[model samples]
Target: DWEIPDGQITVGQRIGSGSFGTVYKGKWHGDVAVKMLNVTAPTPQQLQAFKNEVGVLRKTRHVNILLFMGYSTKPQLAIVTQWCEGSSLYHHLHIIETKFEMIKLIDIARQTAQGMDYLHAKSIIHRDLKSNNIFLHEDLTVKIGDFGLATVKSRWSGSHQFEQLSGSILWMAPEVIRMQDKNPYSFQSDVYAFGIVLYELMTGQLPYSNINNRDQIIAMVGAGALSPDLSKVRSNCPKAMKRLMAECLKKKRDERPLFPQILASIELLARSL
Candidate 1:
């Protein structure tokens, strides 16, 4: 009985687990998902951080962004959200091996762009945005999750950095790997990740899907010597959209198109089709 009016929620089966939390399919007013935070203290720092996170969740509401129903302080520190039944882009692409039409791919690109734009406009940067963090509803509605936690722990330490092992390496901006601290993860870095996500959407393959070596992958991609192979992207995909994706992946962060530019380009591609 804290922020959520109903006091306690009926947490169903545990659906997912993260480095900091575990997510459960739950029910509050309706079907809801709850992420039980591992840290369960009433420390001033923790409470203040929770308050700030809740403030962000409540304020940055958009159709393409995950809806924050409420949070709790008792039983466990948890965040409640509507259940996304279709799972994540990573799940469908790699595990399920789902086939998507060109139109559906474009739609996903547009929605993801739209949501990222909204977050950037609200002064939020999704430093950890990857296909896995992007959830999709059964109807193909895209809702971005985990935006508020980007700064929670700042997991960019050079040692632990290479161990998303490859997942983190693929979406990372070159500058991020080069020197990423002191609040260096800007909107530019986020845009680069979006480009990688676009690559996934287009080819249904993870970024650097063909690469196996860790340091070699980092060495090439980080030094502006490599990029996502566009040859694999569908031939049906618009040239303009392909160009936009390449722009997003520019080796220089400043050279990459901002979210506003990306959104407009995506919508134009959608309309062109």
Candidate 2:
């Protein structure tokens, strides 16, 4: 047996699924959220990754990041996060335009930026940051979820070496797609993804959905030729907020602002709205 101890108490439905595992909406003794795990991993890598996530969640305590309820990786690996009452940000955006006002969007953006700030300080890159990964609560608190591909940047080596493309293609940074070989990942790449999420949040539309070829879209992104036009966005969006959205989606990695500046900009937008 691995390290999972046993009999932690469980009950619920299979709410989510991915290649690595399935998530069950279970209640331990108290608190709730779908628990995630891989059933048949003969290798130690998946178990160790679970352990790392547990450690990361234990050490990380930020309002915008998902709260870790508990974890057991000893005998059978699983993690319990606080149940987000509201659905993924993705679903919320599509239902109704009036549901999300500028203020609400600003609040969520600010919270996400704060969460990103916390992660950046720890040198952790949320490699898979996306609209679907952000969760909301009944009271409107925003928390980042689904830290499946998060990786730590090596300050010494300045690398974020991965065997293959590990994140959603649409949100991927230019270097990750364009580079011929493994390259270093930095906070800036996370910034790139965040910018895409921001664009999605501001405008309830996917930027390049019209394109027939998905790979070509990625190539366009790699070549720095792709750009999302925010001018046609809903009139409800504030000018200042739209500018920040544009800044986040800047083509060049070095051209994009870091999380700190982005957070500060978000704060300013909060005040404006």
Candidate 3:
């Protein structure tokens, strides 16, 4: 693990919190973000998951990946990374502004796909792939962050069963919701979530937003009975881009295009602009 000397790290104001812990805008000599465990006494599994996240970040060095500085597992545990001033893609699309130009939309999709490509190549599955977890730099350069629910394929071999279901229901794959197949949560599962993210980017709305209950939402997704209205996007989005999103949402995991394939499709669409 990457252990940072507590002397160099200075915790700052709170920025956000999640299932794992609370994130604070902190500094390690220079400015950085610090995610600290919330529970006073964390379970073994929780600590391991935190360590797993750190392990994933330590190995990831791609431009599209979040920059990992270091971590501390001493008196107070925390994970540090480079700070992104632009916030999350979710904020940009839903909170900040809903409408965006065609070029801008395509660029977001392209950059995110590029980042996912790097992770998938390294055999990492970002189970929670959604707009909320995708952060943007000041220049709108997309970077995939939040490796809390991420898993290395090799680490889990026999079957894919989770102690608990992670990630947003709106973005989860059907297989993941149903737990119907061996290793249902795979790279292809991420592709399904990516499709939902694309839909979010285009429509500025979450899929199945009307459904509030968690069980009901899970059931709807498991039965393959949910999706964002393509009609809402078609009027404003290119047909090719719409088609690519559709491909990503394919029911069969293998049917969904991989990140590299998706990246190529985005590039092709970019040229048409």
Candidate 4:
């Protein structure tokens, strides 16, 4: 029972799609990207989940994170935000190689780390951080997106059961794969994801180009075998960049560096250029 004010949307173009909704590039009183719930018969519980995502977005704000504009829960569940003209990290890395340079890529990672630092400072965990969930702008500013799986818990209270993979398996941390109890998701998981994203930017390939599905990915990561090998892609990438990425992919969360430390590391890498 939701109703948007009249004359809300003016134009729309397909943007991307996810499990819960279809993304559309649209103009709603202004330029924006719209995520509309796609379920035909959304149950009350499902509706609350959608609301949870909106609630997170409303309270979130960081230059390195996508700005949540507004939302409507009436007739249809729609979430609007600043349109990402530069498209997603996935599209930019693969489609427009000319727009990116090594230093520029490092800069993007540095900014993302800064954003994550802000979140961690507030006890929030962006459980689903990935290149595809990151949006970029022409100015080289990167905005982390998709806060659906995020949670604010001092201890890891997320659903870690193996019955269903809660987030993207490829980007999941090893501890998560094992369903560690009370093991709060540390900043290190974000570091691991950041490493995978950096790997994708450096080389336009998915993290587990070798594996195919969720279960397979979880099994490999559980066996301490799926961290991305940056050296395999290009020896020319900075030595510092290589090491940071390798540590981010560490099997144990303790083995990974903190987001603030990661920010410092990337800032140094950015300075190296």
**Best-performing candidate as measured by TM-score:** 1
* Model 4 residue pairs with clashes: 2-74, 2-75, 3-74, 3-75, 156-184
RMSD of 1: 2.9
Off by over 4 Å in 3: 39-53, 148-167
Assess the local accuracy of residue 81 in candidate 1 as a C-alpha lDDT between 0 and 100. Answer: 89
List, residue by residue over 1-273, the lDDT tens digit for candidate 2: 222346664758777665445677776656477455545432476546556656666767787888777766555556677777877777687554337877888788888899989988877777777877788878488888766324322111222233123336777777867755355356777887888778778777766767767778878888878777776566887787788777777766778899899999888877866
For candidate 2, what is the lDDT?
A: 0.70
Candidate 2 segments exceeding 4 Å error: 1-4, 42-50, 95-98, 148-167, 179-184
Q: How many backbone clashes does candidate 1 have?
A: 0
Lowest-scoring 10 consecutive residues by lDDT in candidate 2? 152-161
lDDT of 4 by residue, 35-144 (tens): 77554444587566656655666667788878787776664767677887677787777667545677777788888888888878867778778777787776678888
Candidate 3 has what TM-score? 0.87
Backbone clash pairs for candidate 1 read none
Query: Residue by residue across 1-273, what tens digits does model 1's lDDT show?
Result: 228744569989998776556899998878998988765364677577777767777777798998888888767677888888788998988789888888888899899999999999999887878888799898579999877654343442332333343547888888887775555588999999999999998888886767877778889877778788998988887898889989998887879999999999988889889
List ranges where model 1 is wrong by over 4 Å: 5-7, 40-42, 155-167, 180-183
- Each prediction's TM-score against the native? 0.89, 0.83, 0.87, 0.83
Could you say which candidate leads in lDDT? Answer: 1
